[PDB]
Ligand binder design. Sequence first.
Ligand SMILES: C[C@]12CC[C@H]3[C@@H](CC[C@H]4CC(=O)CC[C@@H]43)[C@@H]1CC[C@@H]2O
Lengths: 128, 128
Amino acid sequence: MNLPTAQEVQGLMARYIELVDVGDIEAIVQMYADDATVEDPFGQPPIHGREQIAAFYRQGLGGGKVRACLTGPVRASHNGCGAMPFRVEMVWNGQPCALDVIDVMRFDEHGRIQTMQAYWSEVNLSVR
Amino acid sequence: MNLPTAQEVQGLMARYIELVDVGDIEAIVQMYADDATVEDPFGQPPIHGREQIAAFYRQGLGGGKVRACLTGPVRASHNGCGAMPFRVEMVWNGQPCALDVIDVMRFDEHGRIQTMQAYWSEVNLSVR
Ligand SMILES: C[C@]12CC[C@H]3[C@@H](CC[C@H]4CC(=O)CC[C@@H]43)[C@@H]1CC[C@@H]2O
């Protein structure tokens, strides 16, 4: 793939959420460029490269207990970038919880994620 | 105000949408810091200069018949940044239209907007 068009960004970012939802860490990591950076949550030190990104997603998704779904359309640019709102359902203190997140992504000319920023904090964590 | 807490970011970004929806251009521009940049849509060159930002908002909102509402919660960081999904309603090509947008904002140590990035493209335009 080339630098993704706006429509292609919409497709790639939706697929990323599907991979999070099923917990396919290997497929998530393969969507990232080999030297990609992740900031999650934004404000925390960036994570660099597929080895470190895989380890990160393994800790976050490896334990099971995680679902994710878009809560609105992917917003896409003409320069291979986009932003999406979604909700992660997981377990907090032994009960279900929901976390509202926005991921911002920049794709490279091979259609892989070069940078990702995940905007959320504890103000976005809700419980029953 | 100092660097907005996550909670203050939620309030400021919601306030920004409230001002867009009412259409008070001078109130919107006052939210910006002196060296603020606007990238809207993201992928276009940044606008700088308080007068250029006012002219930008006048061109977009001048008609008075634009509405704007959050379509999900503000996601707020602990470094004075956040991201929010919203929908704009307006008239274009003689049609009532909607546009889905995500704004990413960074605030300075005074609570003013330092950087504004509006993610959207024509794929996010719909006819109502
Ligand atoms: C110009 C416009 C009305 C105002 C919208 C703008 C899209 C971006 C958002 C970003 C904001 O944060 C403010 C509103 C602004 C629209 C694109 C076409 C339509 O005519």
